Amino acid sequence: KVFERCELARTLKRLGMDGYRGISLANWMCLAKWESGYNTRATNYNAGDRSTDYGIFQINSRYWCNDGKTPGAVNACHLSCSALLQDNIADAVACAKRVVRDPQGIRAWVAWRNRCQNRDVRQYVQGCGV
Ligand SMILES: *[C@@H]1O[C@H](CO)[C@@H](O[C@@H]2O[C@H](CO)[C@H](O)[C@H](O)[C@H]2O)[C@H](O)[C@H]1NC(C)=O
Protein backbone atom coordinates (compact mmCIF):
# COMPACT_ATOMS: atom_id res chain seq x y z
CA LYS A 1 0.00 0.00 0.00
CA VAL A 2 1.26 3.45 -0.93
CA PHE A 3 -0.09 5.72 1.80
CA GLU A 4 -1.18 9.28 1.13
CA ARG A 5 0.88 11.90 3.06
CA CYS A 6 -1.70 13.03 5.65
CA GLU A 7 -3.10 9.50 5.92
CA LEU A 8 0.28 8.25 7.06
CA ALA A 9 0.77 11.25 9.36
CA ARG A 10 -2.45 10.44 11.25
CA THR A 11 -1.60 6.72 11.38
CA LEU A 12 1.87 7.34 12.90
CA LYS A 13 0.36 9.76 15.45
CA ARG A 14 -2.21 7.12 16.48
CA LEU A 15 0.63 4.61 16.83
CA GLY A 16 2.55 6.89 19.25
CA MET A 17 5.41 8.12 17.04
CA ASP A 18 4.98 11.84 17.61
CA GLY A 19 7.66 12.82 20.11
CA TYR A 20 8.99 9.28 20.50
CA ARG A 21 12.55 9.63 21.97
CA GLY A 22 12.04 13.27 21.06
CA ILE A 23 11.56 12.70 17.35
CA SER A 24 8.78 14.78 15.76
CA LEU A 25 6.18 13.30 13.42
CA ALA A 26 7.54 15.62 10.66
CA ASN A 27 10.92 13.89 10.98
CA TRP A 28 9.35 10.45 10.83
CA MET A 29 7.39 11.59 7.74
CA CYS A 30 10.56 12.91 6.09
CA LEU A 31 12.42 9.60 6.44
CA ALA A 32 9.40 7.48 5.33
CA LYS A 33 9.16 9.74 2.26
CA TRP A 34 12.80 9.40 1.24
CA GLU A 35 13.33 5.82 2.37
CA SER A 36 10.30 4.31 0.65
CA GLY A 37 8.03 6.94 -0.85
CA TYR A 38 5.39 5.82 1.69
CA ASN A 39 5.18 2.36 0.06
CA THR A 40 4.79 -0.58 2.42
CA ARG A 41 5.95 -3.06 -0.23
CA ALA A 42 9.24 -1.33 -0.93
CA THR A 43 12.17 -3.83 -0.90
CA ASN A 44 15.82 -3.08 -1.61
CA TYR A 45 18.48 -5.76 -1.79
CA ASN A 46 22.14 -4.98 -1.14
CA ALA A 47 24.11 -7.38 -3.37
CA GLY A 48 27.34 -6.39 -1.65
CA ASP A 49 26.46 -7.40 1.90
CA ARG A 50 23.66 -9.81 1.00
CA SER A 51 20.93 -8.20 3.12
CA THR A 52 17.57 -6.63 2.27
CA ASP A 53 15.71 -3.55 3.46
CA TYR A 54 11.95 -4.07 3.88
CA GLY A 55 8.91 -1.84 3.93
CA ILE A 56 8.03 1.79 4.50
CA PHE A 57 10.90 2.31 6.97
CA GLN A 58 13.37 0.17 4.97
CA ILE A 59 14.37 -2.00 7.94
CA ASN A 60 17.39 -4.29 7.46
CA SER A 61 17.22 -8.09 7.58
CA ARG A 62 20.70 -8.46 9.11
CA TYR A 63 19.84 -6.74 12.39
CA TRP A 64 16.11 -6.34 12.92
CA CYS A 65 13.93 -8.85 11.11
CA ASN A 66 14.45 -12.41 9.94
CA ASP A 67 13.98 -13.43 6.29
CA GLY A 68 16.04 -16.62 6.61
CA LYS A 69 18.39 -15.87 3.70
CA THR A 70 20.57 -13.17 5.31
CA PRO A 71 23.99 -14.39 6.49
CA GLY A 72 24.70 -13.42 10.09
CA ALA A 73 21.21 -12.04 10.80
CA VAL A 74 20.35 -11.06 14.42
CA ASN A 75 16.56 -10.39 14.46
CA ALA A 76 16.49 -7.85 17.32
CA CYS A 77 12.85 -7.00 16.58
CA HIS A 78 11.85 -10.68 16.82
CA LEU A 79 9.91 -10.32 13.56
CA SER A 80 9.59 -12.16 10.28
CA CYS A 81 10.55 -9.63 7.63
CA SER A 82 7.28 -10.45 5.89
CA ALA A 83 5.53 -8.67 8.78
CA LEU A 84 7.10 -5.46 7.46
CA LEU A 85 5.51 -5.81 4.00
CA GLN A 86 1.88 -5.75 5.27
CA ASP A 87 -0.61 -2.91 4.65
CA ASN A 88 -1.07 -2.55 8.41
CA ILE A 89 2.18 -0.85 9.54
CA ALA A 90 1.76 -1.57 13.26
CA ASP A 91 4.61 -4.13 13.38
CA ALA A 92 6.78 -1.85 11.23
CA VAL A 93 6.26 0.90 13.83
CA ALA A 94 6.98 -1.30 16.85
CA CYS A 95 10.23 -2.35 15.14
CA ALA A 96 11.09 1.21 14.06
CA LYS A 97 10.77 2.19 17.78
CA ARG A 98 13.18 -0.60 18.71
CA VAL A 99 15.70 0.59 16.09
CA VAL A 100 15.80 4.13 17.59
CA ARG A 101 16.42 2.69 21.05
CA ASP A 102 19.85 1.57 19.82
CA PRO A 103 22.79 3.94 20.58
CA GLN A 104 22.77 5.52 17.09
CA GLY A 105 19.14 6.54 17.27
CA ILE A 106 17.59 7.93 14.11
CA ARG A 107 21.02 8.03 12.45
CA ALA A 108 20.25 4.41 11.48
CA TRP A 109 18.24 5.75 8.53
CA VAL A 110 20.58 6.86 5.79
CA ALA A 111 17.93 8.93 4.03
CA TRP A 112 17.18 10.91 7.16
CA ARG A 113 20.84 11.90 7.35
CA ASN A 114 21.06 12.90 3.65
CA ARG A 115 17.68 14.62 3.25
CA CYS A 116 16.15 15.49 6.63
CA GLN A 117 18.77 16.20 9.27
CA ASN A 118 19.48 19.87 10.03
CA ARG A 119 16.73 20.85 7.59
CA ASP A 120 13.22 22.24 7.87
CA VAL A 121 10.77 19.31 7.57
CA ARG A 122 7.55 20.98 8.80
CA GLN A 123 6.26 20.74 5.23
CA TYR A 124 5.69 17.01 5.57
CA VAL A 125 2.83 17.50 8.10
CA GLN A 126 1.29 20.74 6.84
CA GLY A 127 -2.48 20.49 6.48
CA CYS A 128 -2.80 16.98 7.97
CA GLY A 129 -4.32 18.02 11.29
CA VAL A 130 -1.69 16.38 13.49
C1 LIG B 1 21.20 0.10 8.23
O2 LIG B 1 22.43 -0.63 8.29
C3 LIG B 1 23.25 -0.18 9.38
C4 LIG B 1 24.61 -0.84 9.25
O5 LIG B 1 25.39 -0.20 8.25
C6 LIG B 1 22.56 -0.47 10.70
O7 LIG B 1 23.36 0.10 11.75
C8 LIG B 1 23.87 -0.75 12.70
O9 LIG B 1 22.77 -1.22 13.47
C10 LIG B 1 23.19 -2.09 14.53
C11 LIG B 1 21.94 -2.73 15.10
O12 LIG B 1 22.27 -3.79 15.97
C13 LIG B 1 24.01 -1.28 15.53
O14 LIG B 1 23.25 -0.17 16.02
C15 LIG B 1 25.26 -0.77 14.80
O16 LIG B 1 26.02 0.06 15.68
C17 LIG B 1 24.86 0.03 13.56
O18 LIG B 1 26.01 0.32 12.79
C19 LIG B 1 21.19 0.20 10.72
O20 LIG B 1 20.50 -0.21 11.88
C21 LIG B 1 20.37 -0.14 9.48
N22 LIG B 1 19.19 0.71 9.45
C23 LIG B 1 17.97 0.20 9.30
C24 LIG B 1 16.78 1.18 9.32
O25 LIG B 1 17.77 -1.00 9.18
If you take atom 16 of ligand 1, which residue's CA is the nearest one? Answer: 104
From residue 116, alpha-carbon distances to 12, 55, 67, 69, 100 in Å are 18, 19, 29, 32, 16
Convert 67-88 into a string of H (helix), E (strand) and C (coil).
CCCCCCCCCCCCEEHHHHHCCC
Mutate to test the pocket of ligand 1, among 60, 79, 84 (most ligand atoms within 8 A of CB): 60
Which atom of ligand 1 lies at the shortest distance from residue 99's CA? 20
CATH number at residue 4: 1.10.530.10
Which helix (H) or strand (E) element contains residue 54?
A: strand 51-54
Experimentally determined by: X-ray
Resolution (A): 1.7
Residue of the CA atom closest to atom 21 of ligand 1: 108
Domain residues for the domain of 98 are: 1-130
DSSP 51: E
Bridge partners of 59? 54
Q: How many domains does the chain have?
A: 1
Residue 35 annotated to the active site: yes
